[PDB]
């Protein structure tokens, strides 16, 4: 179907404890494939998936070069942001940046992304047009003016429409055995008596990939949205993910409840009941 590549970047200042820590990771869909940490003994872009390991020394050198330069730029940017917000040099601050691309089944750009946050809040973002900017406040407007002057959007558009898509397609082919394999969830319902009057029904989805999934409980065919406890999808640590949905049901009424499972790894959405 559709696929994504994302690069995430976080710099965190720590005055009195050296330079801001820089950590960046790259993903294709929900698969981590590269990482760089400025606190590593010998900081370099490192492989994190089998299919990227085949890339040659030139690849790893260029990626490492880019990471080191980004860490430097982030540190200058953090200093700039202190000025823009009239802030002290004493405090710790956070600068985040994500960029990347989505491709469709035809393999052409579906959407491009490039956005920044300072201290957990949206700062500036490249719009979906890949030509204009949304600035969150008067500080970010200064950045917008600079980036409009330097035609930054045009440079990002060229990358997002070109190399981003082209290299994403390369990775999808090289990692096809895993990146293009959907693992359906293993599913079951468990029963956990709470009292004489009520029991929890917990619907499980285990060992699935990619992370996207829908788990819903119905009572008499009515969606139990307000009454369902849904945990955040969580990593198992083996590439796969886990999730559960739970409802509290009156004892004896368990058969009025059905769990519904949707995942791209399944031909048809599943319907599950508790089986005593």
């Amino acid at each position: 179907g559709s696929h994504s590549m994302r690069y995430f970047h976080t710099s965190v200042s720590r005055p009195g404890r050296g330079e801001p820590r820089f950590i960046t990771v790259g993903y294709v869909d929900d698969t981590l494939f590269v990482r760089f940490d400025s606190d590593a003994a010998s900081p370099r872009e490192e492989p994190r998936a089998p299919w990227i390991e085949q890339e040659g020394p030139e690849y790893w050198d260029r990626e490492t070069q880019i990471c080191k330069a980004k860490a430097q730029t982030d540190r200058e940017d953090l200093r700039t942001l202190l000025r823009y917000y009239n802030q002290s040099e004493a405090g710790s601050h956070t600068l985040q940046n994500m960029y990347g691309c989505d491709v469709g089944p035809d393999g052409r750009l579906l959407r491009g992304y490039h956005q920044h946050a300072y201290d957990g809040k949206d700062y500036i973002a490249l719009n979906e047009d890949l030509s204009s900017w949304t600035a969150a406040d008067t500080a970010a407007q200064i950045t917008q003016r600079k980036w409009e002057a330097a035609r930054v959007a045009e440079q990002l558009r060229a990358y997002l429409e070109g190399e981003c898509v082209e290299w994403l397609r390369r990775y999808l082919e090289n990692g096809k055995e895993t990146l293009q394999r959907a693992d359906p969830p293993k599913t079951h319902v468990t029963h956990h008596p709470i009292s004489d009057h009520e029991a929890t029904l917990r619907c499980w989805a285990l060992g699935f990939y990619p992370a996207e999934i829908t788990l819903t409980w119905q009572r008499d065919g009515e969606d139990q949205t307000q009454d369902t406890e849904l945990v955040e999808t969580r990593p198992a640590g083996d590439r796969t993910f886990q999730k559960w949905a739970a409802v509290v049901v009156p004892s004896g009424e368990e058969q009025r409840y059905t769990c519904h499972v949707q995942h791209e790894g399944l031909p048809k959405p599943l319907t599950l009941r508790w089986e005593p």
């Binding site: 070069q65 990471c67 200058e76 942001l81």
Partner: peptide
Amino acid sequence: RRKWRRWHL
């Protein structure tokens, strides 16, 4: 593959 950043905030 990454984009080389050539701009500042």
